[PDB]
Coordinates of C-alpha atoms and ligand atoms in Angstrom, one line a residue:
X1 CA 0.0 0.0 0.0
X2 CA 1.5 3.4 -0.9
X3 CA 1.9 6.4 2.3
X4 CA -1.9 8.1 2.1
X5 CA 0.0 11.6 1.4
X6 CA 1.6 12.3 -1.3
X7 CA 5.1 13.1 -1.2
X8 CA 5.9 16.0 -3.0
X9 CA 9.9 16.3 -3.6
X10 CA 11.5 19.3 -2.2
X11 CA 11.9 21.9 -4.9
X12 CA 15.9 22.2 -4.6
X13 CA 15.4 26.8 -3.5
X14 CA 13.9 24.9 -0.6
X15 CA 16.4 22.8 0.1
X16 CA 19.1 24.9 0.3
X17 CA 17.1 27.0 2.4
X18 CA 16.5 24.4 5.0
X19 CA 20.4 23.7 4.8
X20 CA 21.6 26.7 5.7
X21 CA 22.6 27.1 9.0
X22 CA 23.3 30.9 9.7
X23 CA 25.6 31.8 13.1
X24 CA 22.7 33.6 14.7
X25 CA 21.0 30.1 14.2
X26 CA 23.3 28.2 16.2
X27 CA 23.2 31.0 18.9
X28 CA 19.8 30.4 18.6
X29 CA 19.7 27.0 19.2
X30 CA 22.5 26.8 21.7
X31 CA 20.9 29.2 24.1
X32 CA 17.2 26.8 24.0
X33 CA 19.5 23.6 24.4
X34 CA 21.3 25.3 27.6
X35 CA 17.9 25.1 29.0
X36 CA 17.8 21.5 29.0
X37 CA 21.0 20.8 30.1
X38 CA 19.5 20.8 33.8
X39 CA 18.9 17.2 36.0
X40 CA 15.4 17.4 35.0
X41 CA 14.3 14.1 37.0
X42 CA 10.6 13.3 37.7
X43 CA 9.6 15.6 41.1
X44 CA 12.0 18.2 40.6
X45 CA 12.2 21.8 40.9
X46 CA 14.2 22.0 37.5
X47 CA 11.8 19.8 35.6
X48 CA 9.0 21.6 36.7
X49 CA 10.8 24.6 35.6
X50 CA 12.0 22.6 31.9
X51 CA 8.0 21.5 31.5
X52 CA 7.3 25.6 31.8
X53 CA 9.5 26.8 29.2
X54 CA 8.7 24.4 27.0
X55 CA 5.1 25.4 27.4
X56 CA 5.7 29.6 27.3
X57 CA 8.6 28.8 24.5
X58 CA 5.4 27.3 22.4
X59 CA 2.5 29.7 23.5
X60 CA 5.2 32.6 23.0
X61 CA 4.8 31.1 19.0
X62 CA 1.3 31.0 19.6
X63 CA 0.7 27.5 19.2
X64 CA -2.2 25.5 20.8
X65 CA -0.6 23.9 24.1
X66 CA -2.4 21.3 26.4
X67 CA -1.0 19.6 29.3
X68 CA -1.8 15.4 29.8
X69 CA -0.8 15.5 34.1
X70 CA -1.5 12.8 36.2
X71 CA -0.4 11.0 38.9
X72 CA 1.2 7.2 38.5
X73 CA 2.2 4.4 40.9
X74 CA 5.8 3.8 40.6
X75 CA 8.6 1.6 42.4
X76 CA 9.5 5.0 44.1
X77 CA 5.8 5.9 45.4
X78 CA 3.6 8.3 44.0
X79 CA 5.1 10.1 41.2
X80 CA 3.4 13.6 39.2
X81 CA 3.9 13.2 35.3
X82 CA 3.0 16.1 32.5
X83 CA 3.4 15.1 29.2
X84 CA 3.5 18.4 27.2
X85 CA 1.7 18.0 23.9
X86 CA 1.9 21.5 21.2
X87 CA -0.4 21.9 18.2
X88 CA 0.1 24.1 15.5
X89 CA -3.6 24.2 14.0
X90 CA -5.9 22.3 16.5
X91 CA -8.9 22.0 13.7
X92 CA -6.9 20.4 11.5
X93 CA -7.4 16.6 10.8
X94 CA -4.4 15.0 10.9
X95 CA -0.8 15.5 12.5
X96 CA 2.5 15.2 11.6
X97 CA 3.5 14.7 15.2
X98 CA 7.4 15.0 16.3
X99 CA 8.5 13.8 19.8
X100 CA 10.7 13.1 22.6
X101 CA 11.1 12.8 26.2
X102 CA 11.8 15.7 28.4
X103 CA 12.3 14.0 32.2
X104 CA 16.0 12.4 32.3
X105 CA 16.7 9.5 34.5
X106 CA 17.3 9.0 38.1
X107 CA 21.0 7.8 38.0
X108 CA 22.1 6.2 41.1
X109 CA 25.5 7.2 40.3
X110 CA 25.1 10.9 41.1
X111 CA 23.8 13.4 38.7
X112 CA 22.4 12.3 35.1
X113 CA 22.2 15.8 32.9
X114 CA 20.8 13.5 29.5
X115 CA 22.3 15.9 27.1
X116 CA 21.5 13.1 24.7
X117 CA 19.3 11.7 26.4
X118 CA 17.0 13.7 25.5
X119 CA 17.8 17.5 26.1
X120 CA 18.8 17.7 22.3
X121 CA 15.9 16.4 20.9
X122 CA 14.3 18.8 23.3
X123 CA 15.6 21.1 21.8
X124 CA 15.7 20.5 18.3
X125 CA 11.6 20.1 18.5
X126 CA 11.7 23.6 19.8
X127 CA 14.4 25.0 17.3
X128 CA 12.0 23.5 14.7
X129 CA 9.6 25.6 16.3
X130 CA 11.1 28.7 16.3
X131 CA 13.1 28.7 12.6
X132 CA 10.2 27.7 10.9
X133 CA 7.6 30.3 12.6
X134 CA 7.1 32.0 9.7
X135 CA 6.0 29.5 7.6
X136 CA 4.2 27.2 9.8
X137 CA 2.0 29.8 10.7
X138 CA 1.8 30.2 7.0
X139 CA 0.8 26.6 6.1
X140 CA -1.9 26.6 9.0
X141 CA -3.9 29.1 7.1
X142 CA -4.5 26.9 4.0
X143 CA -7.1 25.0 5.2
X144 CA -5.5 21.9 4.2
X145 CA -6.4 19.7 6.7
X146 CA -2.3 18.8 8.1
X147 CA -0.5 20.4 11.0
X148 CA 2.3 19.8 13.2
X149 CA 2.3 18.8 16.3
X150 CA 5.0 18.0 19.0
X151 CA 5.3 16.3 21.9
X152 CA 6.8 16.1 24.6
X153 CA 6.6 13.0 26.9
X154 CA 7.1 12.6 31.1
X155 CA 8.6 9.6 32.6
X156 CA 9.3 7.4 29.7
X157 CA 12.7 6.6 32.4
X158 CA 12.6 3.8 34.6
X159 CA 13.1 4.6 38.4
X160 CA 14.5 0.8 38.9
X161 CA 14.9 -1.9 36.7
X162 CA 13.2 -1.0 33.3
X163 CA 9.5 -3.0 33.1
X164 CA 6.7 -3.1 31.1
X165 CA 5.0 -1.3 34.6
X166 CA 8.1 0.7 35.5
X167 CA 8.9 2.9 32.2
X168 CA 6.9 4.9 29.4
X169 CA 4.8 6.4 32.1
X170 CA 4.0 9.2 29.8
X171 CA 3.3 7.7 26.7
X172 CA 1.2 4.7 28.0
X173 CA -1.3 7.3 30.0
X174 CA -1.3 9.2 26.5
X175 CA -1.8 6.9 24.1
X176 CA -4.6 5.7 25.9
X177 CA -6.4 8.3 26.9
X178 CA -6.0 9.7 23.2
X179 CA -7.4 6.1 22.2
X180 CA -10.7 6.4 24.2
X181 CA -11.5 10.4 23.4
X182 CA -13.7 9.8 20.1
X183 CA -13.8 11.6 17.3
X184 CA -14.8 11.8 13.8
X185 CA -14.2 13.0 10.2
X186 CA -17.1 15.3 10.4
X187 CA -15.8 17.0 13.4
X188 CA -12.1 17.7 12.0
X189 CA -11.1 19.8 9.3
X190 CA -10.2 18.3 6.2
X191 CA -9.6 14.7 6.4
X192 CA -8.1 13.0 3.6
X193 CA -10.7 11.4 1.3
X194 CA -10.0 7.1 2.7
X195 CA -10.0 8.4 6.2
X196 CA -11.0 6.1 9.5
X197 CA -10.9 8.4 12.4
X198 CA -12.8 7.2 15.5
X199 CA -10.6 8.7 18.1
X200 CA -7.6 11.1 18.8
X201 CA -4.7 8.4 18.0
X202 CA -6.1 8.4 14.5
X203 CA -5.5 11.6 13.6
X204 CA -1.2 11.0 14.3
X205 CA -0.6 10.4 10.8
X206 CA 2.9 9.6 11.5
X207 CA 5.0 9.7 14.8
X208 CA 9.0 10.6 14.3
X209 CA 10.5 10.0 17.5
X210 CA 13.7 11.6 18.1
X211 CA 15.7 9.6 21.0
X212 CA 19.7 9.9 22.4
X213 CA 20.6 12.3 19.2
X214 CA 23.6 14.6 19.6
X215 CA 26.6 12.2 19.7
X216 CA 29.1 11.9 16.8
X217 CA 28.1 10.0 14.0
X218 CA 24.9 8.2 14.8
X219 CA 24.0 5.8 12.6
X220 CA 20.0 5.1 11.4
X221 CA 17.6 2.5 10.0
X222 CA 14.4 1.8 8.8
X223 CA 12.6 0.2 11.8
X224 CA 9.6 0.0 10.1
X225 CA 8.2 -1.3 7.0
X226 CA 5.0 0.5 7.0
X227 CA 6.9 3.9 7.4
X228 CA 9.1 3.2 4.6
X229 CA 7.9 5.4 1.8
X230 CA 8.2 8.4 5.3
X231 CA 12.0 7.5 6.6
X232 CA 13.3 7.5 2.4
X233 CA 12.3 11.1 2.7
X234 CA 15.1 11.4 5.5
X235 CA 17.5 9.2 2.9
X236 CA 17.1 11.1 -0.3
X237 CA 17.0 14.8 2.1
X238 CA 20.1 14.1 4.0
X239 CA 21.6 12.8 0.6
X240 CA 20.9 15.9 -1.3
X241 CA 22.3 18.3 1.5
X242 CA 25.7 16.4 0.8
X243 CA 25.1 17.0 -2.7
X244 CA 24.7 20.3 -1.9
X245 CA 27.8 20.6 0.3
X246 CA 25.8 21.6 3.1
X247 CA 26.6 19.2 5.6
X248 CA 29.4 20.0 8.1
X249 CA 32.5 17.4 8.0
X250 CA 35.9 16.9 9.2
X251 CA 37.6 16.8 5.7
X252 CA 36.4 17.9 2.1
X253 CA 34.9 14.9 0.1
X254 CA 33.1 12.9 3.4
X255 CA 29.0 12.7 3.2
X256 CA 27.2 12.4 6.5
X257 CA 25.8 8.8 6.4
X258 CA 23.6 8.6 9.0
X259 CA 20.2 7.6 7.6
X260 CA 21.4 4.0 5.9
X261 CA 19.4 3.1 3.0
X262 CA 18.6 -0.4 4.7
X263 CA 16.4 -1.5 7.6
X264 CA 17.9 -3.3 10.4
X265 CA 16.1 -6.0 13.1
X266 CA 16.2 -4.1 16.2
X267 CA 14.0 -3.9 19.0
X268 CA 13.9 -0.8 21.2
X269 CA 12.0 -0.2 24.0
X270 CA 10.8 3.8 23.4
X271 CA 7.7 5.8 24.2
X272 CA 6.2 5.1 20.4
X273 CA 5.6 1.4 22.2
X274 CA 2.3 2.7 22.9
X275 CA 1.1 4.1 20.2
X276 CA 2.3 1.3 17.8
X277 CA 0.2 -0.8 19.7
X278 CA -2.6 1.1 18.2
X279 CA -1.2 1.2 14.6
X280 CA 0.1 5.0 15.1
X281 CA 3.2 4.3 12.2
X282 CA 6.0 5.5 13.8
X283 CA 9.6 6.9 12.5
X284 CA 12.2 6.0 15.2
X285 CA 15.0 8.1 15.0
X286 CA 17.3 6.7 17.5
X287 CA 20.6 5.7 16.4
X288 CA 21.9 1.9 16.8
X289 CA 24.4 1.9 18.3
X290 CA 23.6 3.7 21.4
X291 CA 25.7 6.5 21.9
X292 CA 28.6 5.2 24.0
X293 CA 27.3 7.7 26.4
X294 CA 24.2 6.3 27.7
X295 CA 23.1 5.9 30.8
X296 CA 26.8 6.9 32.2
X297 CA 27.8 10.1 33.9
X298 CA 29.6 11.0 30.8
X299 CA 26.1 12.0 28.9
X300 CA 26.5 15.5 29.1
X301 CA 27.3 18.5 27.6
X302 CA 31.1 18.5 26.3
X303 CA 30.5 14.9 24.7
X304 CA 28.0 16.8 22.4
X305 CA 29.6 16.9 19.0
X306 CA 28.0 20.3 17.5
X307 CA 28.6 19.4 13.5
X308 CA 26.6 16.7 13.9
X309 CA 23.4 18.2 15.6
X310 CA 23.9 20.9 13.0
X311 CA 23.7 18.5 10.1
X312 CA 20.0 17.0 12.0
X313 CA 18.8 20.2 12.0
X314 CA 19.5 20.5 8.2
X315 CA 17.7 17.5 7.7
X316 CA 14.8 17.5 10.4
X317 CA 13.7 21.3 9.1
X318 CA 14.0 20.1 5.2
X319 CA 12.0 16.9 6.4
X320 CA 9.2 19.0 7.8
X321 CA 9.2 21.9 5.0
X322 CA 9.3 18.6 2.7
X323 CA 6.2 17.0 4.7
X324 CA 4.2 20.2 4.9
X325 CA 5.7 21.7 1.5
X326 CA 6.3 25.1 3.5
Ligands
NI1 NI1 17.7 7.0 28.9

């Protein structure tokens, strides 16, 4: 079966818009990801204080933002969990929905700052945001029936050994409640034609989940077959910025190489468990390997490698100007 959008190629002006990366852009982003760089563990002063600027960051770009909080049983007690969920045009049927976790793990080793894991992503959903203002407020007006939509999940970290009851926290509560709020075609604007929307899951047309990006070098797959046609996109993108000589290496001549044209047979545990489960297609983009990072004390900030986060960017905003044709 073919993807229910079409995919209309970048036009190349558009692409070597996307590509650019001025210096006031990486001051731009650089000052959102220090913001992030915070033990932001589940409880805490500081990721109470992440979860609000990620919320005033998205209202300050005037998008629609609701807040999923609840309470959940853990191995730790009673735990409060706010997954933070931004929509560009509410009304409009479907979502291209980006997303991450925000809460970083309890490390019993001392103090866990994530930078990978996931303050980047963090803040690459929010640079997304704020680069592509202009025309993503642009794109809501056409009536067209697509918007973004980003968010930003609580407690997908274990606080002991990771379980199917201790981890995803989040995501599970989400996905669910999403699952039971009903809907229909003829409340929504614009649904595409073969539509089957009977609650809020339906309308995530596709979930890219960005996971433990910022390391040197990270190397992608296909995870999923029925995303296929979506994670080509990534491919053929990040293989026409190379073309282009936009991507940022350490000699003339290299291309960046991290989306491999092949799928691998991986499992990972992630908070698009939950909404596979209810035939949300997902985009995974998490490299395999881990970085070498994870889970250690060493996940921080100086273990960053900048060219690299760079070169996503690139690719992330020509993905979602591609997706959206902004
Ligand atoms: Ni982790």
């Amino acid at each position: 079966l073919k993807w229910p959008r079409d995919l209309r190629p970048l036009a190349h002006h558009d692409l070597l818009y996307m590509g650019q990366i001025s210096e006031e852009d990486r001051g731009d982003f650089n000052a959102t990801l220090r913001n992030f760089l915070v033990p932001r563990v589940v409880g805490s002063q500081k990721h109470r204080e992440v979860r609000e600027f990620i919320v005033r960051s998205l209202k300050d770009l005037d998008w629609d933002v609701e807040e999923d909080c609840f309470d959940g049983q853990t191995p730790h007690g009673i735990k409060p969990f706010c997954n933070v969920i931004a929509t560009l045009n509410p009304s409009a049927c479907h979502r291209l929905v980006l997303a991450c976790h925000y809460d970083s793990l309890l490390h019993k080793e001392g103090t866990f700052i994530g930078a990978t894991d996931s303050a980047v992503p963090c803040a690459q959903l929010l640079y997304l945001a704020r680069s592509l203002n202009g025309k993503l407020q642009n794109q809501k007006t056409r009536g067209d029936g697509l918007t973004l939509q980003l968010v930003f999940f609580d407690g997908e970290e274990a606080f002991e050994r990771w379980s199917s009851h201790d981890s995803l926290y989040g995501s599970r509560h989400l996905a669910q409640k999403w699952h039971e709020d009903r809907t229909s075609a003829e409340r929504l604007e614009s649904c595409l034609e073969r539509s089957e929307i009977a609650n809020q899951i339906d309308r995530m047309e596709v979930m890219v989940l960005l996971d433990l990006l910022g390391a040197e070098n990270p190397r992608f797959y296909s995870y999923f077959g029925e995303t296929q046609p979506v994670y080509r996109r990534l491919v053929n993108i990040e293989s026409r910025l190379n073309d282009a000589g936009l991507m940022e290496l350490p000699r003339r001549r290299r291309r960046t190489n991290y989306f491999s044209n092949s799928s691998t047979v991986g499992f990972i545990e992630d908070d698009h468990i939950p909404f596979l489960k209810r035939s949300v297609p997902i985009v995974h983009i998490i490299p395999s390997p881990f970085p070498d990072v994870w889970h250690t004390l060493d996940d921080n900030e100086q273990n960053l490698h900048h060219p690299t986060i760079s070169n996503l960017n690139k690719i992330f905003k020509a993905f979602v100007s591609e997706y959206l044709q902004l």
